[PDB]
Design a binder for this molecule. Structure first.
Ligand SMILES: [Zn+2]
Ligand SMILES: [Zn+2]
Ligand SMILES: [Zn+2]
Ligand SMILES: [Zn+2]
Ligand SMILES: [Zn+2]
Ligand SMILES: [Zn+2]
Ligand SMILES: [Zn+2]
Ligand SMILES: [Zn+2]
Length: 203
């Protein structure tokens, strides 16, 4: 099964492991994971984070042929489980100093959900890209500006977190995968760049 292939100790996730638009797995509602986690589910999360770290590293990305990512969802690996990884780096200053914190968000989340959110909407100015979609897709992907999420970590510990900005967008994008929703579902059908008043456009 897919999962067996992915959790092999020597196996590194690459783009040949990522399923693409058209595969039905991407449209299902993924199954909740139960605790305590199986070994496979723990390992899968670790491999998914490793994939993100590799995608962000100029060397490994080039070694393995990776498109950069800041989030990955298990359905994109053909695994219909509610497991996401997110890895959002902070940036250097103009002087080339590293940020105080490497990342603004770094988590492998089990059973994540949005529990509340702002009335306000937001969208990335640059639109969204998807590792599973090999097409140019223009437009504003209209999301909640701010969200409160719940999720469990690999140990079974429950977290409750509020997010805003880019990090809010990322998490939402990944939770959508485990509900079978694609980014372009949230692009206006008639004018991809329509702006309803009060939409927060994030640069
Ligand atoms: Zn592989
Ligand atoms: Zn482990
Ligand atoms: Zn590595
Ligand atoms: Zn709650
Ligand atoms: Zn609501
Ligand atoms: Zn995605
Ligand atoms: Zn929502
Ligand atoms: Zn459409």
């Amino acid at each position: 099964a897919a999962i067996d292939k992915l959790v092999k100790a020597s196996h590194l996730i690459d783009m040949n492991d990522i399923i693409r638009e058209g595969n039905p797995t991407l449209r299902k509602v993924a199954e909740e994971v139960t605790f305590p986690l199986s070994e496979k589910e723990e390992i899968l999360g670790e491999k998914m984070m490793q994939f993100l770290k590799h995608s962000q590293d100029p060397i490994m990305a080039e070694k393995l042929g990776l498109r950069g990512g800041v989030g990955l969802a298990a359905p994109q690996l053909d695994i219909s489980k509610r497991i996401i990884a997110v890895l959002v780096p902070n940036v250097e200053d103009a002087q080339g100093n590293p940020p105080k914190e490497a990342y603004s968000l770094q988590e492998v989340m089990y059973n994540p959900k949005v529990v509340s959110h702002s009335v306000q909407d937001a969208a990335l100015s640059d639109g969204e890209g998807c590792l599973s979609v090999d097409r140019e897709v223009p437009g504003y992907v209209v999301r909640h500006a701010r969200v409160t999420i719940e999720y469990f970590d690999k140990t079974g510990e429950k977290h409750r977190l509020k997010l805003k900005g880019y990090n809010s967008i990322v998490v939402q994008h990944e939770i959508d995968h485990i509900d079978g929703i694609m980014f372009y579902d949230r692009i206006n059908e008639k004018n991809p760049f329509a702006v309803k008043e009060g939409l927060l456009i994030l640069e």
